[PDB]
């Protein structure tokens, strides 16, 4: 009977993480500030759209394997497992640092769910692989702002008041 | 100095209410069940899209009058003022009853914010009028399922196991 | 000289009937109530669009055969030949019953106009056949809500307060 | 209790006037004749589309504030308050004169409804302002054919058989 | 064996007439002059597109009933049966007069072909009815510039140097 | 040599099942009757389109691994393994019951084919997982009409003449 | 009472023939081989789309005149009246030969149904004429690959291993 | 008589300010230089499009209330009331500073015009509120590049040669 | 060093002339009056769009050859070389006369710039040829309203109060 | 005065050649037969569209330099200078041979017109270069069917009854 | 540490193979000759687009797992492992033979990479499965030109100068 | 005979340079890092698309003048004449510096080819002018990141670790 239970756990846990990212990307989209604010405003809206699409796919896969989906605000708050994004005006370097970490953590967790369910539910595993793909792409897109190169360490001093990020 | 403060209060309070409706319409979209489940699945997705558009407009009007916007999950939970939507599978008659009440309550509250800010911030008042317009349309769209007519009281007995809703 | 006169009579009579259906479908679209209100709201808007397209085609065919077209409100009222749709909130079962009858009556009348003009004006007859096609499709779409089947008479008791429609 | 009553009166009266304009613009579209017939055929179809959109918005605002909407042909005829458009072939100069007057009269009446309801129903007032905007634009578009200029009074003699319009 | 022969004759004769109209509408589109030049430039391009579509449909119906289609320039010139459009700059009133006559003549000829083939080839008759429909609409669109009305004979004096057309 | 043979068997068996569903969804689309007829008409057309897309993908994957694809009507009839849909007018409750069962059975069979071929042909397994995903979504969409909830068992009595489905 | 019976017979017989062509064109689309395989792959997909559209129109015309439509696989097999398309890889010359014959036979049969029903049901006759039009166009499109010309008999030897087709 | 005069003054003054912004945003779009040049190139083109749309709406509202609109270059130069944008290559930090100030000043002036005309011309007031909305959004979009945050003052030193902006 | 200088002079001079035409076409679009007002309203908006596109292309070609572009309002006023368009309501005949002259003058000037730069900067010459093409097309489109024909001198008396233009 | 005369001669001569190609490509499109009939049907429709676009551009450039354009059928026949395309069914190899020659001849003639007018009318020369570009591309597209390669002379024996083309 | 190393090796090796196919399909697209040149021109452009899409996806998956991507021309040349496509004009039969082999070889190599990485990186394995799917489809599309059938071996003699391919 | 030879040399040399830029822009798109990585990612994709379009146009112009086109990877490597882009992660300042130089060099070389061929092949010269236009625009778009202004030298210190670029 832990067939359905394992699939549900992986889908529901991924759903809540995506919804948390939905609210955080949108929050950063509105409030990000600094040299890169508009670049990140646009980039975060793209991430928001991709995350939102997969949140709907994950929720409906849960209904498809026969379980209701819990997307309520109390459930997002109850099932954090990750830091909250600060309120107020948000600096561009802070947004980059925040999602570099958040996307990496979410991607790692999905990666393990994939292995957990691939035996009993390869079609769910397939969907979670597609979520992992996009979250890891988004992680790269945040990582690349500070990626070291042969000619420049890209410390971020220029977007962080002269101090490395 | 309560110029900005009055506008911010009206915008932020509306923003949180819209985000609460975002999560509730999406929750009902996934989990609604019964004779009208597909009708409501489609209708709730339309509401979700309209609510989501105005949530972004409200948040950016707040940035435009010079204040950050708080769209975090903890803030949605902290600033409820309305019932939560039940978890689990949701009956069509329950969804109709829930949003008939929720949209009416949200619309009434926006209606009062409009009067509060129209003197100091008519452009914000204009945006909140547009939000009120759509929320009240959505209220009608839920109300109409049970609207009494000369030939039929439309008690809802047929979607509520033989009992009036 | 009754060449033009026969064509004009068939086109003008069809034009007025289409315009009457335009106003009735739109009236039902706004005011329909009950379990099927949203289903019928959507369906009636589709009918409205198809009826409106053919009303313009019929009027311009009348101009093309050399006669002015009378689409005035007084002419719609003067040339009824069919019941009026009730005012006020309209029950879903009442809307279905109303258009099941109205579309059947309009279709039968167009069907006879086709035979009347096919000899002297086959191109007008061709247009009226296309109108008959769509009106008869719409009749089916209303009829199907109450169509008897081997497993269920579909009396409509569920959308008509427990009583067969 | 005259809250709803004042809003309903303003919405319903505007709805009937828009529907009257719907039928008149379409009638003029089919039957207009003369040098400017095609120019006006195209222009009147644009007006028809804008008027039709606002007729639906007005009717659904009426449902949104809790009242049924009366869009029946008998109601258009009963609630005239304006001249009827002539039947038969219509001269271009006659169409221009007719709508120059009709749009001005309708716009003035909406303008007063706006003031009547802005206190109790600013969101309805907002919609009626948008209707007033388009009707007054359309009035200009008809007025401009005969607008006096420094170099030419534009009497219309050229579209009215040598006589000023 | 005169089954195919009757269909071919009707299709080929219609094809050549459409191709003649193709070249004449395009010629008038480029060279028309006067007050209505731009109105007619646009209108004639619309006619050109509709005529061109039916020319392809007629030619392929001929291939479908098993005969090659002759759309060569020498065949258009050889099979005139109608006046040629003048070269040089063309006055707006001259273009209106020309196509009022040409479309009427072409429409009458198609009308008779329809009756000739409807017994042996109703599907070809159906296509020729659709051609007749559009040609007669185009005739109206040219006729309407000079259509007499109760208030104005619309003699065309204003587009023809003070003289009735 | 049973590499190709195992892949072919899984692809061909899935192809025939999809084609059977193609014809059954289309049959139900035309003939469904009752309160939910239009809801199901629309929903079944969506299913038809998704099933049709995957039928083409499955057939071309079979050609891609080097085998011809058998999509003939005799093969659909020969390779049933599932009930036939009744002829005649079909009740809405009967359609829901029929596809709830059919989609579940087809999904289970695809699920096992996935495991059978994932070792020798993971790319075919990947395609069959995508088919399983959509069939299981469609199963949910039919299941949800009768899904039990805390407030309502949703027996279907209202769409099945007073009797539970 | 043989009014409905004659229309039903013509519509149902045409429906089954179209559905048979649906499956055969799709089968040929997947499996066709040789020099012209890709040309025919594309062409057959176009035919498939046109045939599929008319199959839906025919089925819904049957519902519109008040009869259920039988589109089940057993009915396609039971009501053959035409050869089956071979299974396995299909040569380009074989596909051309097959549909040249099949489309001609189907077109001839529809042609007679048109005459049978035109008196009692001209609107159905109109639809069947449109089906005949497209089937006869498709016949030409297959015929043209082997059409004799003054300079070349087009025997097909080049697509049929040196032997005339 | 100062009804029209007050509306005209508010519309014309807004029109000239929008046209001045049109030319300045386009000038900055072409000539902006530095780290943010491409970000601002894109952003300024978006502003240009929104400003251009409202310039046309304002001018046509002026025609709609019965007055000609003055959009000539001499009038833009004559009615400055704001600094001119420098010629030559423009630094990104200079563009941000320039429009942060310009949009704030224009927004404040429109805000007062709204109050001036809302009594006599609420529909004009409504349009000017929509202009104020977009100008204030654009002000935020320029302001955000230098917005102070808890972790970073965003002095702009990085886009202004090491010196705070 | 007069390589860049010759290209810059030709590009900048063309840019200013296009921007002057931008403002003049838009001014005429809003204020044109008389029989042809709507025809010219539409035509002038098309010209405005084409002129605006080439203004951006010319400005960016200037940046591409390494020089900043001066599109400021003071520069348009300073670099007139052509008459200003009158303010106030503008008669249709006056607009036609104005742009007939203005487009001819601008086209002639561009024509000479092309020859000046074709040796040192053929790619700039290529762009200026494309500008010349469109300006000369627009000149024709204004010229054609008064173009003499064999049957009618088209004096414009009908759009100019009985007097030749 | 031979400025205009040289431009007119080059434009008019090109216009007539394009119109001749219009009719010939369309004739070949309908009547082409053989193995490549459908390939050429599609390709010739693409050529037809490109040729038709440039025919309109050439004619309007003629109006733009101040001369009427002669696109009449008699002028196409009078100004041949090239062979006529045969009537009747046309073999694929014959169509390829025909346009290989025709496009080469037309391209060579345009090429010389370009040099003739480039001094006095570089903008016309620019347009004729664009026509030459497309005609020479089309020549390649016909040439390539018989282009010799290291491994195959591509004699065309397979599309020409065993004989080299 | 060979986690990343195994994924990188599989992604980079696939990337280089796709880029090699990009250049080869484009080369064949331009230079292919013979009876099938246009068929292959079109087909190869479709392959080019699909290959190009997956090349970008593979490169960005490499960035997503934390490694730079090497898409330089020297790397394509250095990492051949497959024959080069001949220069000069290319015969249709040669292109078919070339890609039949090349796509098969590339597909086999991707197939093995999938198994190599599926344990440590199932999301990368998922992407490589999608690449394998399209490459194997393209292989079929080239294979089908010479696929043996019961009625015809399809030796290719007709596209290869009388000799089997 | 050096007619074709001069055109071929100019086209082929331009083709190879464009293909080299294709691979370099795509390489920079994937691997660029630092503050401007996303700005350049987007900008480089736009350049890639424009370069790719002109590469196809240049190759097909070569086929149109009768010569095969060499777009093979070995030819790109053999015909360098320009530096290679570094492998590995690429800093934003390095990408800007690289393409500022590369686009300038390519543009200068095309500029000379234009003069070389304009006499014998003005249509090829026309195409190469269009390539020069876009390459020089792209050069500006890279140059502008470091363009000196009156208020800021834009040394790039902020994107290059504190050191001028
Ligand atoms: Ca770093
Ligand atoms: Ca910062
Ligand atoms: Ca009730
Ligand atoms: Ca229920
Ligand atoms: Ca019943
Ligand atoms: Ca009811
Ligand atoms: Ca006047
Ligand atoms: Ca008149
Ligand atoms: Ca008259
Ligand atoms: Ca005239
Ligand atoms: Ca149940
Ligand atoms: Ca039922
Ligand atoms: Ca033959
Ligand atoms: Ca063969
Ligand atoms: Ca700051
Ligand atoms: Ca700077
Ligand atoms: Ca004149
Ligand atoms: Ca005038
Ligand atoms: Ca050869
Ligand atoms: Ca042949
Ligand atoms: Ca073979
Ligand atoms: Ca060959
Ligand atoms: Ca610098
Ligand atoms: Ca850097
Ligand atoms: Fe959903
Ligand atoms: Fe999988
Ligand atoms: Fe936003
Ligand atoms: Fe307001
Ligand atoms: Fe508003
Ligand atoms: Fe508004
Ligand atoms: Fe119309
Ligand atoms: Fe007919
Ligand atoms: Fe018909
Ligand atoms: Fe028809
Ligand atoms: Fe509506
Ligand atoms: Fe308001
Ligand atoms: Fe065609
Ligand atoms: Fe018929
Ligand atoms: Fe397919
Ligand atoms: Fe997989
Ligand atoms: Fe259907
Ligand atoms: Fe008929
Ligand atoms: Fe405008
Ligand atoms: Fe307002
Ligand atoms: Fe630009
Ligand atoms: Fe040039
Ligand atoms: Fe044109
Ligand atoms: Fe040139
Ligand atoms: Fe050019
Ligand atoms: Fe060009
Ligand atoms: Fe990319
Ligand atoms: Fe997988
Ligand atoms: Fe997958
Ligand atoms: Fe997938
Ligand atoms: Fe290409
Ligand atoms: Fe040139």
mmCIF file with all atom_site columns, N, CA, C and O in Angstrom, chain A residues 93 96-97 100 142-149 152-159 165, chain L residues 33-35 37:
data_model
loop_
_atom_site.group_PDB
_atom_site.id
_atom_site.type_symbol
_atom_site.label_atom_id
_atom_site.label_alt_id
_atom_site.label_comp_id
_atom_site.label_asym_id
_atom_site.label_entity_id
_atom_site.label_seq_id
_atom_site.pdbx_PDB_ins_code
_atom_site.Cartn_x
_atom_site.Cartn_y
_atom_site.Cartn_z
_atom_site.occupancy
_atom_site.B_iso_or_equiv
_atom_site.pdbx_formal_charge
_atom_site.auth_seq_id
_atom_site.auth_comp_id
_atom_site.auth_asym_id
_atom_site.auth_atom_id
_atom_site.pdbx_PDB_model_num
ATOM 1   N N  . UNK A 1 93  ? 22.325 41.701 -5.348  1.00 0.00 ? 93  UNK A N  1
ATOM 2   C CA . UNK A 1 93  ? 23.283 40.668 -4.932  1.00 0.00 ? 93  UNK A CA 1
ATOM 3   C C  . UNK A 1 93  ? 22.656 39.698 -3.946  1.00 0.00 ? 93  UNK A C  1
ATOM 4   O O  . UNK A 1 93  ? 22.939 38.494 -3.984  1.00 0.00 ? 93  UNK A O  1
ATOM 5   N N  . UNK A 1 96  ? 20.458 37.215 -5.920  1.00 0.00 ? 96  UNK A N  1
ATOM 6   C CA . UNK A 1 96  ? 21.277 36.221 -6.605  1.00 0.00 ? 96  UNK A CA 1
ATOM 7   C C  . UNK A 1 96  ? 21.767 35.169 -5.615  1.00 0.00 ? 96  UNK A C  1
ATOM 8   O O  . UNK A 1 96  ? 21.640 33.954 -5.840  1.00 0.00 ? 96  UNK A O  1
ATOM 9   N N  . UNK A 1 97  ? 22.322 35.624 -4.488  1.00 0.00 ? 97  UNK A N  1
ATOM 10  C CA . UNK A 1 97  ? 22.766 34.688 -3.458  1.00 0.00 ? 97  UNK A CA 1
ATOM 11  C C  . UNK A 1 97  ? 21.625 33.806 -2.977  1.00 0.00 ? 97  UNK A C  1
ATOM 12  O O  . UNK A 1 97  ? 21.797 32.588 -2.815  1.00 0.00 ? 97  UNK A O  1
ATOM 13  N N  . UNK A 1 100 ? 20.549 31.220 -5.759  1.00 0.00 ? 100 UNK A N  1
ATOM 14  C CA . UNK A 1 100 ? 21.637 30.276 -5.995  1.00 0.00 ? 100 UNK A CA 1
ATOM 15  C C  . UNK A 1 100 ? 21.566 29.136 -4.990  1.00 0.00 ? 100 UNK A C  1
ATOM 16  O O  . UNK A 1 100 ? 21.631 27.955 -5.359  1.00 0.00 ? 100 UNK A O  1
ATOM 17  N N  . UNK A 1 142 ? 21.242 31.766 -12.017 1.00 0.00 ? 142 UNK A N  1
ATOM 18  C CA . UNK A 1 142 ? 21.634 32.612 -10.888 1.00 0.00 ? 142 UNK A CA 1
ATOM 19  C C  . UNK A 1 142 ? 23.132 32.478 -10.593 1.00 0.00 ? 142 UNK A C  1
ATOM 20  O O  . UNK A 1 142 ? 23.807 33.466 -10.282 1.00 0.00 ? 142 UNK A O  1
ATOM 21  N N  . UNK A 1 143 ? 23.657 31.266 -10.688 1.00 0.00 ? 143 UNK A N  1
ATOM 22  C CA . UNK A 1 143 ? 25.075 31.041 -10.417 1.00 0.00 ? 143 UNK A CA 1
ATOM 23  C C  . UNK A 1 143 ? 25.969 31.861 -11.342 1.00 0.00 ? 143 UNK A C  1
ATOM 24  O O  . UNK A 1 143 ? 27.024 32.372 -10.925 1.00 0.00 ? 143 UNK A O  1
ATOM 25  N N  . UNK A 1 144 ? 25.559 32.010 -12.606 1.00 0.00 ? 144 UNK A N  1
ATOM 26  C CA . UNK A 1 144 ? 26.437 32.568 -13.635 1.00 0.00 ? 144 UNK A CA 1
ATOM 27  C C  . UNK A 1 144 ? 26.828 34.021 -13.364 1.00 0.00 ? 144 UNK A C  1
ATOM 28  O O  . UNK A 1 144 ? 27.840 34.490 -13.900 1.00 0.00 ? 144 UNK A O  1
ATOM 29  N N  . UNK A 1 145 ? 26.045 34.749 -12.554 1.00 0.00 ? 145 UNK A N  1
ATOM 30  C CA . UNK A 1 145 ? 26.365 36.136 -12.235 1.00 0.00 ? 145 UNK A CA 1
ATOM 31  C C  . UNK A 1 145 ? 27.670 36.257 -11.454 1.00 0.00 ? 145 UNK A C  1
ATOM 32  O O  . UNK A 1 145 ? 28.312 37.314 -11.489 1.00 0.00 ? 145 UNK A O  1
ATOM 33  N N  . UNK A 1 146 ? 28.061 35.204 -10.748 1.00 0.00 ? 146 UNK A N  1
ATOM 34  C CA . UNK A 1 146 ? 29.255 35.210 -9.903  1.00 0.00 ? 146 UNK A CA 1
ATOM 35  C C  . UNK A 1 146 ? 30.240 34.123 -10.295 1.00 0.00 ? 146 UNK A C  1
ATOM 36  O O  . UNK A 1 146 ? 31.132 33.788 -9.511  1.00 0.00 ? 146 UNK A O  1
ATOM 37  N N  . UNK A 1 147 ? 30.111 33.567 -11.492 1.00 0.00 ? 147 UNK A N  1
ATOM 38  C CA . UNK A 1 147 ? 30.949 32.448 -11.889 1.00 0.00 ? 147 UNK A CA 1
ATOM 39  C C  . UNK A 1 147 ? 32.372 32.933 -12.140 1.00 0.00 ? 147 UNK A C  1
ATOM 40  O O  . UNK A 1 147 ? 32.579 33.905 -12.863 1.00 0.00 ? 147 UNK A O  1
ATOM 41  N N  . UNK A 1 148 ? 33.352 32.264 -11.535 1.00 0.00 ? 148 UNK A N  1
ATOM 42  C CA . UNK A 1 148 ? 34.747 32.616 -11.759 1.00 0.00 ? 148 UNK A CA 1
ATOM 43  C C  . UNK A 1 148 ? 35.186 32.261 -13.176 1.00 0.00 ? 148 UNK A C  1
ATOM 44  O O  . UNK A 1 148 ? 34.811 31.216 -13.714 1.00 0.00 ? 148 UNK A O  1
ATOM 45  N N  . UNK A 1 149 ? 36.031 33.107 -13.756 1.00 0.00 ? 149 UNK A N  1
ATOM 46  C CA . UNK A 1 149 ? 36.583 32.931 -15.089 1.00 0.00 ? 149 UNK A CA 1
ATOM 47  C C  . UNK A 1 149 ? 38.095 33.122 -15.042 1.00 0.00 ? 149 UNK A C  1
ATOM 48  O O  . UNK A 1 149 ? 38.620 33.668 -14.067 1.00 0.00 ? 149 UNK A O  1
ATOM 49  N N  . UNK A 1 152 ? 38.663 36.990 -14.622 1.00 0.00 ? 152 UNK A N  1
ATOM 50  C CA . UNK A 1 152 ? 37.905 37.767 -13.649 1.00 0.00 ? 152 UNK A CA 1
ATOM 51  C C  . UNK A 1 152 ? 37.243 36.814 -12.661 1.00 0.00 ? 152 UNK A C  1
ATOM 52  O O  . UNK A 1 152 ? 36.483 35.922 -13.071 1.00 0.00 ? 152 UNK A O  1
ATOM 53  N N  . UNK A 1 153 ? 37.506 36.965 -11.355 1.00 0.00 ? 153 UNK A N  1
ATOM 54  C CA . UNK A 1 153 ? 36.816 36.112 -10.372 1.00 0.00 ? 153 UNK A CA 1
ATOM 55  C C  . UNK A 1 153 ? 35.326 36.399 -10.249 1.00 0.00 ? 153 UNK A C  1
ATOM 56  O O  . UNK A 1 153 ? 34.608 35.561 -9.689  1.00 0.00 ? 153 UNK A O  1
ATOM 57  N N  . UNK A 1 154 ? 34.848 37.534 -10.756 1.00 0.00 ? 154 UNK A N  1
ATOM 58  C CA . UNK A 1 154 ? 33.451 37.961 -10.612 1.00 0.00 ? 154 UNK A CA 1
ATOM 59  C C  . UNK A 1 154 ? 32.992 37.849 -9.159  1.00 0.00 ? 154 UNK A C  1
ATOM 60  O O  . UNK A 1 154 ? 32.070 37.106 -8.823  1.00 0.00 ? 154 UNK A O  1
ATOM 61  N N  . UNK A 1 155 ? 33.663 38.614 -8.289  1.00 0.00 ? 155 UNK A N  1
ATOM 62  C CA . UNK A 1 155 ? 33.341 38.574 -6.865  1.00 0.00 ? 155 UNK A CA 1
ATOM 63  C C  . UNK A 1 155 ? 32.006 39.221 -6.542  1.00 0.00 ? 155 UNK A C  1
ATOM 64  O O  . UNK A 1 155 ? 31.479 38.999 -5.447  1.00 0.00 ? 155 UNK A O  1
ATOM 65  N N  . UNK A 1 156 ? 31.456 40.020 -7.451  1.00 0.00 ? 156 UNK A N  1
ATOM 66  C CA . UNK A 1 156 ? 30.234 40.741 -7.165  1.00 0.00 ? 156 UNK A CA 1
ATOM 67  C C  . UNK A 1 156 ? 30.437 42.053 -6.449  1.00 0.00 ? 156 UNK A C  1
ATOM 68  O O  . UNK A 1 156 ? 29.449 42.683 -6.049  1.00 0.00 ? 156 UNK A O  1
ATOM 69  N N  . UNK A 1 157 ? 31.691 42.488 -6.270  1.00 0.00 ? 157 UNK A N  1
ATOM 70  C CA . UNK A 1 157 ? 31.941 43.726 -5.536  1.00 0.00 ? 157 UNK A CA 1
ATOM 71  C C  . UNK A 1 157 ? 31.177 44.893 -6.136  1.00 0.00 ? 157 UNK A C  1
ATOM 72  O O  . UNK A 1 157 ? 30.781 45.813 -5.416  1.00 0.00 ? 157 UNK A O  1
ATOM 73  N N  . UNK A 1 158 ? 30.956 44.864 -7.452  1.00 0.00 ? 158 UNK A N  1
ATOM 74  C CA . UNK A 1 158 ? 30.325 45.978 -8.146  1.00 0.00 ? 158 UNK A CA 1
ATOM 75  C C  . UNK A 1 158 ? 28.824 46.064 -7.886  1.00 0.00 ? 158 UNK A C  1
ATOM 76  O O  . UNK A 1 158 ? 28.247 47.149 -8.024  1.00 0.00 ? 158 UNK A O  1
ATOM 77  N N  . UNK A 1 159 ? 28.175 44.961 -7.516  1.00 0.00 ? 159 UNK A N  1
ATOM 78  C CA . UNK A 1 159 ? 26.753 44.988 -7.185  1.00 0.00 ? 159 UNK A CA 1
ATOM 79  C C  . UNK A 1 159 ? 26.517 44.862 -5.684  1.00 0.00 ? 159 UNK A C  1
ATOM 80  O O  . UNK A 1 159 ? 25.363 44.744 -5.250  1.00 0.00 ? 159 UNK A O  1
ATOM 81  N N  . UNK A 1 165 ? 30.555 39.205 -2.649  1.00 0.00 ? 165 UNK A N  1
ATOM 82  C CA . UNK A 1 165 ? 29.257 38.695 -2.230  1.00 0.00 ? 165 UNK A CA 1
ATOM 83  C C  . UNK A 1 165 ? 29.387 37.424 -1.392  1.00 0.00 ? 165 UNK A C  1
ATOM 84  O O  . UNK A 1 165 ? 30.024 36.450 -1.800  1.00 0.00 ? 165 UNK A O  1
ATOM 85  N N  . UNK L 2 33  ? 29.740 34.857 -18.209 1.00 0.00 ? 33  UNK L N  1
ATOM 86  C CA . UNK L 2 33  ? 29.673 34.848 -16.755 1.00 0.00 ? 33  UNK L CA 1
ATOM 87  C C  . UNK L 2 33  ? 29.860 36.280 -16.253 1.00 0.00 ? 33  UNK L C  1
ATOM 88  O O  . UNK L 2 33  ? 30.443 37.117 -16.930 1.00 0.00 ? 33  UNK L O  1
ATOM 89  N N  . UNK L 2 34  ? 29.382 36.559 -15.059 1.00 0.00 ? 34  UNK L N  1
ATOM 90  C CA . UNK L 2 34  ? 29.598 37.871 -14.488 1.00 0.00 ? 34  UNK L CA 1
ATOM 91  C C  . UNK L 2 34  ? 28.324 38.692 -14.424 1.00 0.00 ? 34  UNK L C  1
ATOM 92  O O  . UNK L 2 34  ? 27.220 38.225 -14.710 1.00 0.00 ? 34  UNK L O  1
ATOM 93  N N  . UNK L 2 35  ? 28.502 39.954 -14.038 1.00 0.00 ? 35  UNK L N  1
ATOM 94  C CA . UNK L 2 35  ? 27.370 40.855 -13.832 1.00 0.00 ? 35  UNK L CA 1
ATOM 95  C C  . UNK L 2 35  ? 26.474 40.928 -15.060 1.00 0.00 ? 35  UNK L C  1
ATOM 96  O O  . UNK L 2 35  ? 25.243 40.938 -14.946 1.00 0.00 ? 35  UNK L O  1
ATOM 97  N N  . UNK L 2 37  ? 26.144 38.696 -17.492 1.00 0.00 ? 37  UNK L N  1
ATOM 98  C CA . UNK L 2 37  ? 26.044 37.429 -18.220 1.00 0.00 ? 37  UNK L CA 1
ATOM 99  C C  . UNK L 2 37  ? 24.673 37.290 -18.872 1.00 0.00 ? 37  UNK L C  1
ATOM 100 O O  . UNK L 2 37  ? 24.567 36.864 -20.029 1.00 0.00 ? 37  UNK L O  1
#
